[PDB]
Chain A
Amino acid sequence: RLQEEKRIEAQKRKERQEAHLYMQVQIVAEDQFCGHQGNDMYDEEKVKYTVFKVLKNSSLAEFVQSLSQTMGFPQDQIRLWPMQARSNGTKRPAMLDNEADGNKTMIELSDNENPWTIFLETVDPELAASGATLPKFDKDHDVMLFLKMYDPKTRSLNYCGHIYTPISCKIRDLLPVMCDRAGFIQDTSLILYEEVKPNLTERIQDYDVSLDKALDELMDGDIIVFQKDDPENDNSELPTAKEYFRDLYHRVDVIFCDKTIPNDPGFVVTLSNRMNYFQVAKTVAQRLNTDPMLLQFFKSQGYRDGPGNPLRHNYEGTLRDLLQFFKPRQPKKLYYQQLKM
């Protein structure tokens, strides 16, 4: 039974050779969207896929069959929304003809893209018994919107699912769904934003208009963030969804090392390129239970890895001006020392 080991290298090649024949279809299921705190639907590094080695010139009906089987669903009670990267640095689900663009080879539906990520829409697992089917979708008068709730109090995003809705329907007819899915009372006054892309978070002003108008460049996969219109958002440092998405686009992790501690491993803080000295000192101060006026920061020599000039506590710049001398790996870093009393 060692000759069963003439076949480990007979596929360590037979597969290395045929590899050009196959593509990697990376399925994502909607659950992987919960918790995600950034833009778009997930995070390619923290996302987890169900991977499919599928024949480049395979068929799509063949995939749905293989798919339905492997994951355990009815080849007719599910939907494939191929993930699609856009010119604005955003990857969102896009339509697919599950019957017309189904005469084609799998590789070309991918647009010669491998790997090929595809959002897998499944009927809810509860609604299953109910005789629930996955509702019909008119690829011309309906749209699929994804819903995120923003909580200023935690400054976190709570996924709220998706919805088939006709375009003609008006934003006002969507707010009840939002209150509901967010665990909110009905008629709770809400504020709404389309997440267009990083740093762009347009606020949706006129509710009583149809989506087709209410959303600039409406498309399947657009994203509406909503939040309570409550006065206690104003005690939050990022009171609106927009302010969160800004501070997140501007967000940057920085290492801090005590100059006096030799080979100080130091620690990481997450800061914002448009913070100023007070904001940085106040932050890093909290992270060590000591007064900010007790921290002496040093600029960056940018060449030697040792602290540069002492940073006067009246520094008129921003955190960015201090960090512009860094590159990739060079793990953006400054030096401090604790002061007496």
Chain B
Amino acid sequence: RKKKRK
């Protein structure tokens, strides 16, 4: 699970 936004 590597994300998409911060």
**Which residues does A use to contact B, with CB under 8 Å?**
86-88, 90, 143, 167, 212, 217-220
- Check A143 against B6 for contact (C-beta < 8 Å): no
- B6 shortest CB reach to chain A, Å: 5
A-B contact count (CB 8 A): 22
Q: Cα distance A87–B3 when bound, in Å?
A: 14
Within 8 A of A (CB), among B1-6: 1-6
Q: Cα distance A227–B5 when bound, in Å?
A: 28
- B3 shortest CB reach to chain A, Å: 5
Further 6 A-B residue pairs, CB within 8 A, beyond A86-B5, A167-B1: A87-B6, A143-B2, A212-B1, A212-B2, A218-B1, A219-B2
**Which residues does B use to contact A, with CB under 8 Å?**
1-6
Q: Which residues of A contact B3 (CB under 8 A)?
A: 217-219
Q: What are 21 residue pairs bridging A and B, where the CB atoms are less than 8 Å apart in the complex?
A: A86-B5, A86-B6, A87-B5, A87-B6, A88-B6, A90-B6, A143-B2, A167-B1, A167-B2, A212-B2, A217-B3, A217-B5, A217-B6, A218-B1, A218-B2, A218-B3, A219-B2, A219-B3, A219-B4, A219-B6, A220-B2
Q: Cα distance A86–B5 when bound, in Å?
A: 8
Interface majority SS (helix, strand, loop, mixed), chain B: loop
- B5 shortest CB reach to chain A, Å: 7
Nearest-neighbor residue (CB-CB) of A211 within chain B? B2
For the complex of A and B, the 3 pairs showing the least CB-CB separation, nearest first, are A218-B2, A217-B3, A86-B6
Q: Which residues of B contact A217 (CB under 8 A)?
A: 3, 5-6
Q: Cα distance A218–B4 when bound, in Å?
A: 9
Q: Which residues of B contact A219 (CB under 8 A)?
A: 2-4, 6
Nearest-neighbor residue (CB-CB) of A86 within chain B? B6
Q: Cα distance A219–B1 when bound, in Å?
A: 9
- A303 shortest CB reach to chain B, Å: 42
Q: Which residues of A contact B5 (CB under 8 A)?
A: 86-87, 217
Q: Cα distance A87–B4 when bound, in Å?
A: 12
Q: Which residues of B contact A143 (CB under 8 A)?
A: 2
Nearest-neighbor residue (CB-CB) of B1 within chain A? A212
- A87 shortest CB reach to chain B, Å: 6
Q: Cα distance A306–B3 when bound, in Å?
A: 54
Most buried by B among A88, A219, A220: A219
Most buried by A among B2, B3, B5: B2
Q: Which residues of B contact A218 (CB under 8 A)?
A: 1-3
Q: Cα distance A95–B6 when bound, in Å?
A: 15
Q: Cα distance A134–B6 when bound, in Å?
A: 29
Q: Cα distance A90–B4 when bound, in Å?
A: 14
